[PDB]
């Protein structure tokens, strides 16, 4: 019981019905207020209203039903971020058809693998994805129909959404009389792609139950965004990412104006943030490093900007603080989660921002930190392995029971593979690694930097660096190294290589050990303690 950390009750009691039913209810409301904007394309300036989105979604839902799609079918969406992206997604959710968002820049192998897993009957794609989709269709006969998202009429012999609708929808159809289907909450809502360290991406099977819980969080005044009229958000998260899907769908539930970009550009981003008077900006992790460097932020009027949020992994405390200062904010709105957990399971509570913290456990969820050795449940300010448990946890990997049971134990705990601790206020901190610095006698800093140096070497494929401690005084930097295919190196060559890369005898002082693979990914990064043992055992 103790050391299990629980989220509080939701602010609002749970709505009834599927994700389609709840989504339909909100969209129908916003649709009847003319001029309410759902999506805005920053590159061409075009707006699409909730009225337009709602009507298209209902038409697509009934059209797909008439076409013959049922609970047993899936559709895929393959496209750059666009105004039309979520139209077939809303429609599919209305009728319980699973949706597989598919990376538009997948190579031929990755694309085939993704669609091979989701097995869609219809693929909605942009003009820019048509050729690659045509190619994969030759290999995947389950794909019976291709529909073009960003064309009004037929394009290259393929139907547009409008033409598809015209063929399969009677002229008696009234969008405001349409009623979404009712079905079991364990019905598949999405198949999202996620890669650990193990080769190719797997299919993450998210249920309607998963999604409606996200719908609770998204409009929660503490753990989401309070629904307020004329709220706009600029998002540069790929819609086919887990957090891209879960944040964007949530914004639709909230009735927000979602400003999107096909591709990130500094000027256009800042100009749009200013001119659309967005209250929030949602960024991918690597863009925080970017804006920490940006000098242009001050030259724009961002007086309406209330928050900058990370739509992905947790961020470094210093990078976050630097970006906060750039945008004249007290802190960054953060969240920790996995594709496998639908969305963020730990979120910065509104008005309760601690620097370096990824926030607090969300409603309906539980979290625990376990001893890296004993598996023992830990108290506050004790670093260990982070586990997550709750109703946003995926049904499982598609057709991969083994991978599922390796990640999720029999009681529903997800083994995140990340190291963390929580403080006395139950704020969680994700630590990247387990330590972070090996100390000479006074100081030396060789974490990821030495690893990066090692990775650049032609003969070196992978590498992990840890500190080796012994009664032999102090702490010596050491590394395990994965050589390339059929290549030869000595310990000295690796050491001398690093020696000629940094100063102060902070270049491997313990000893290099060659291995077949870097200790542990366990679906994530480097197992620092595993590395320490292997190197320690080697020293004698």
Author numbering: 5 to 544
The authors write:
At the core of this natural phenomenon lies a fundamental process of energy transduction by luciferase enzymes that convert the chemical energy stored within the ground-state substrate (luciferin) to an excited, emissive state of the product (oxyluciferin) by a spin-forbidden process. Although beetle luciferase systems share identical substrates and chemical reaction sequence, they emit a range of different colors from yellow green (λmax ≈ 560 nm), which is typical for common firefly species, such as the North American firefly Photinus pyralis (GPp) and the Japanese firefly Luciola cruciata (GLc), to orange and even red (λmax = 590–623 nm) from certain click beetles and railroad worms. Here, we describe the first crystal structures of two rare WT luciferases from Brazilian beetles that emit light with exceptional colors; a luciferase from the head lanterns of the glow-worm P. hirtus (Coleoptera: Phengodidae), the only known luciferase that naturally emits red light (λmax = 623 nm; REPh), and a green-emitting luciferase from the firefly A. vivianii (Coleoptera: Lampyridae) that displays a blue-shifted emission relative to common firefly luciferases (λmax = 538 nm at pH 8; GBAv). Biochemical and structural analyses of the two luciferases, combined with computational modeling, provide the best insight yet into the relationship between the structure and color of light emitted by beetle luciferases.
To identify structural features that are important in the color tuning mechanism, the crystal structure of GBAv luciferase with a blue-shifted green emission of lmax = 538 nm at pH 8 was determined for comparison with the REPh. The GBAv crystals diffract to a resolution of 1.9 Å when free of substrate and crystallize in a space group P212121 with two independent GBAv monomers in the asymmetric unit. Although the N-terminal domains of the two GBAv molecules are very similar (root-mean-square deviation [RMSD] value of 0.1 Å calculated on all backbone atoms), their C-terminal domains have different conformations with an RMSD value of 2.1 Å. Thus, although the luciferase in both molecules can be considered as being in its “open” conformation, the luciferase with the smaller aperture is maybe an intermediate between the “open” and “closed” conformations, the latter being attributed to the structure of GLc in complex with the reaction products. We were able to discern with sufficient accuracy the structure of loop in both independent molecules in the crystal of GBAv, in which the open conformation is stabilized by interactions between T527 and K529 of loop, and D422 and D436 of the N-terminal domain. The structural integrity of loop is maintained by interaction between K524 and the backbone of G528. In GBAv, loop is tightly held by strong ionic interactions between E354 on the loop and R337 on the N-terminal domain. The ionic interactions on both sides of loop fix its position relative to the enzyme backbone.
